[model samples]
Target: PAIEVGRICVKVKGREAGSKCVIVDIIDDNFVLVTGPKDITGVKRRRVNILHLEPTDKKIDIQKGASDEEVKKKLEESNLTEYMKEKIKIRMPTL
Candidate 1:
């Protein structure tokens, strides 16, 4: 599944671009709940457009609407805490 619960994704656009987040809930085909826990990757828990996110091969085991704490714990348990802490580098388009 491209956009499913527990899927880890990188923000390709917006203020949090290049930051990593996880899908906590599915609101619709175009939108989903994502969280970066601010403390971890500087992205807040909110609804983000599916197009704005670039899904990665990495994923964690988490239930729908999982809290930030749960996500953090799972990341740590999965040995992905450091992985999630880093940001992806996005190339700036030449003007």
Candidate 2:
């Protein structure tokens, strides 16, 4: 599965859609723990459905259950500082 610890992915569903995040831990076949360091990508550390994510070829080297600070550090070390912070505008339904 593309869902693996340290893998970076883009959220394709929900409010956080279009934001990038990192897989912190695999919780189950359908869900995994992810984070976007709220401060950077506006994604909080939470469990997300695997199907909601689009995995990227990019990945960072971090331990399982790494903290937000740790994840951010690794992201910087990998030179993805700007990539992770970039977000695509998601069109919302007009009232």
Candidate 3:
């Protein structure tokens, strides 16, 4: 599945479409709230990643290889991060 329930991801703001979004919280598998554009971005869509992702429930659990641009690029392109897929819980979720 491209996305699935409980996965954390750097989802393109589904609502706005094609915008970068750092998903911070999720509401089941149907939707999620991203961290971006609250004040700086001039769009009304605001925090809605509502394209209804396939949900991965995967965690963004580490900085182990964040410096690796190649890996990060791959993760950024995919629905879930490599760290999430790896199940490496470097830290707990923000909330």
Candidate 4:
């Protein structure tokens, strides 16, 4: 499936829509754990619906449930360094 660990995807639903995040782990057929390295991508670590994410061709080198530091470093090592420079814009829900 296109949805798998290490795949880069964009949140297409909820307040985080439009921000780029990575798939940290597949919880089930319809759910997955994702993180935006709160510090770098502004996306918090949480479990999100698979349908809410749009898979991208950009893939990073990392493992399942990797730490934010590891994820950040891998992202920097990948080809998306410049492309995602200003692309990861996250939005929090209105409380």
The candidate that achieves the highest TM-score relative to the unseen native structure = 2
Question: Which clashing pairs does model 2 show?
Answer: none
Instruction: Please write out the lDDT profile of model 1 over residues 1-95, one tens digit for every residue.
Output: 47355677676655535777667677766788776657655676778876666877765566666677775665564455564465465433331
Per-residue CA lDDT of model 4 for 5-95, tens digit only, reads 5677776654545767666676766888776657655776678885575887755455666676776666654444556635544334332
Each candidate's lDDT (Cα)? 0.64, 0.65, 0.37, 0.63
Model 4 lDDT, full chain set = 0.63
TM-scores for all predictions: 0.66, 0.68, 0.30, 0.63
lDDT of 3 by residue, 1-95 (tens): 23432233333333333333334444564554443233322121223435644234344533222333433343454443332243223232341
Model 2, 1-95: lDDT tens per residue?
A: 37355677776755635777667676756777776757656777778885576877765566776677776676565465564455565443331
- The superposed Cα distance between candidate 3 and the true structure at residue 9, in angstroms, equals 6.1
Residue 73 error for model 4, in Å? 2.1
Query: Which 10 consecutive residues of model 2 have the lowest summed lDDT?
Result: 86-95
**Model 2 / residue 68 / CA error / Å:** 3.3
Q: Which has the better lDDT: candidate 1, or candidate 3? A: 1
The local distance difference test score of model 2 is: 0.65
Task: State which candidate, 2 or 3, has the greater TM-score.
Answer: 2
